[PDB]
Design a protein around this nucleic acid. Structure first.
Ligand SMILES: [Ca+2]
Ligand SMILES: [Ca+2]
Lengths: 255, 248
DNA sequence: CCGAATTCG
DNA sequence: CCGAATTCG
């Protein structure tokens, strides 16, 4: 990452299924091999557990880890050392979660710009649609509260169905979904796919765009450049790093 | 002056079913209504009614599984025809059962249904309600239309549906929303489902369309409120007894 | 047939 | 962690 790429932020967002203990160390090494290949500035992770933090400190030592909780399972934001200056951590609760979910925010400077970087793992399953929608509103409300000079990026596992974003009232006028921005490309549309991914061993074909990237920037100051899936290679154990595909995204920050 | 009972009699609950069926009819005997709208009837229950209620003409919504029925008191009600309207996307064999009848010079179209069940099937239930309301509008203006049945509705779903049309009224609302007969399915007062919690809903509803003011609800009461010898009620639902006057 | 929880496909 | 069918409190 040299002079030319200095105006770009690159990141990966990925629910890495830390609650599946089977093959977890090898699957962590798989995630870390992906981070080594693309060397993203930032990594947004969901379903991290404490042993997984240890694996990351070993196989992704060039990242500072900021976590959404101390025990159970939680999100984390990883920051590339020497590229990202960490300014503060903020955690916003979801008072009605039944699954210890919350909103993790990290304030940083990168490439000579101020960012508020957000992630969450919104309430899971169709049956908890109401709370998931309430949490999305909390997220979208927080994105709007940041100073107008700050660049806000949310990236996480939203567990959203399309009908739910409408029921939520659609995205506010100044908040954009990166996948939509890039013209809804088919190659990275689905991030959870039980036909293509066998980690859950579900004997049926269902697929969802659970993982999403939202951003709020002053008119034209933040331009998504690319969006691609990662984590599609089977590991030596014959499974994938996670039941989710990860998303690799690059964005330019423009005057 | 006409009377009727509408009641989901829970024919799919096999426990104490003979005693509960006899319990339902003991209740019908007490009030001897002109018309009875039933939901969740099963074939042997239907077979029972043809004997026990042999004094009623019995019209059914199906022959198999579970289904609705409309009983018409011979002498009082003249049966002219039955019509069944399908719900193409039902997953529960639900449909719309109508009968054309007269009492004196007064023509009626009487309708019942058991709308798609459970919170998860709200969207189909709403679609079925639109079909029902649509049908109510088709009758001649001189024909009095009454729907009475188990709608499984939540109030929000009626709103979602667009609300009742200007010329269709809910009898319970018309009577000023009396508290004593508001909830027709109540797990606190009713123990048949053995649900260890308190939920209550107004699932059973009466809708009518008449030329302005021709049909005036007079009373509405719950029935089936007494435990049977087995310590359970005739059904998990209360029945609704309604009396209305035809005013020309 | 409530909401929540559970197996198995 | 899908979703339909089933069981539980
Ligand atoms: Ca998971
Ligand atoms: Ca029933």
């Amino acid at each position: 990452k040299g002079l030319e790429d200095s105006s770009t932020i690159s990141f990966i967002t990925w629910n890495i299924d830390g609650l599946d203990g089977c093959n977890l160390p090898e699957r962590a090494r798989g995630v870390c091999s992906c981070l080594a290949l693309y060397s993203p500035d930032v990594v947004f992770l969901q379903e991290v557990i404490p042993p997984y933090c240890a694996y990351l400190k070993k196989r992704a030592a060039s990242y500072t880890i900021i976590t959404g909780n101390e025990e159970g399972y939680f999100t984390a934001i990883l920051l590339k050392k020497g590229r990202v200056k960490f300014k503060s951590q903020e955690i916003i609760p979801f008072p009605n979660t039944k699954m210890m979910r919350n909103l993790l925010c990290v304030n940083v400077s990168l490439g000579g710009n101020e960012f508020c970087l957000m992630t969450s793992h919104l309430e899971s399953t169709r049956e908890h649609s109401a709370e998931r929608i309430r949490q999305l509103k909390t997220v979208l409300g927080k994105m709007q509260e940041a100073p107008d000079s700050t660049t806000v990026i949310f990236a996480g596992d939203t567990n959203l169905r399309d009908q739910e974003v409408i029921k939520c009232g659609g995205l506010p006028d100044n908040v954009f979904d990166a996948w939509e921005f890039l013209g809804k490309p088919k190659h990275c549309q689905y991030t959870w796919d039980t036909k293509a991914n066998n980690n859950l061993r579900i004997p049926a074909a269902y697929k969802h765009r659970f993982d999403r990237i939202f951003f709020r920037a002053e008119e034209g100051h933040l331009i998504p450049q690319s969006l691609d899936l990662v984590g599609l290679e089977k590991l030596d154990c014959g499974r994938f790093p996670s039941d989710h595909w990860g998303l690799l995204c690059t964005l330019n920050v423009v005057l």
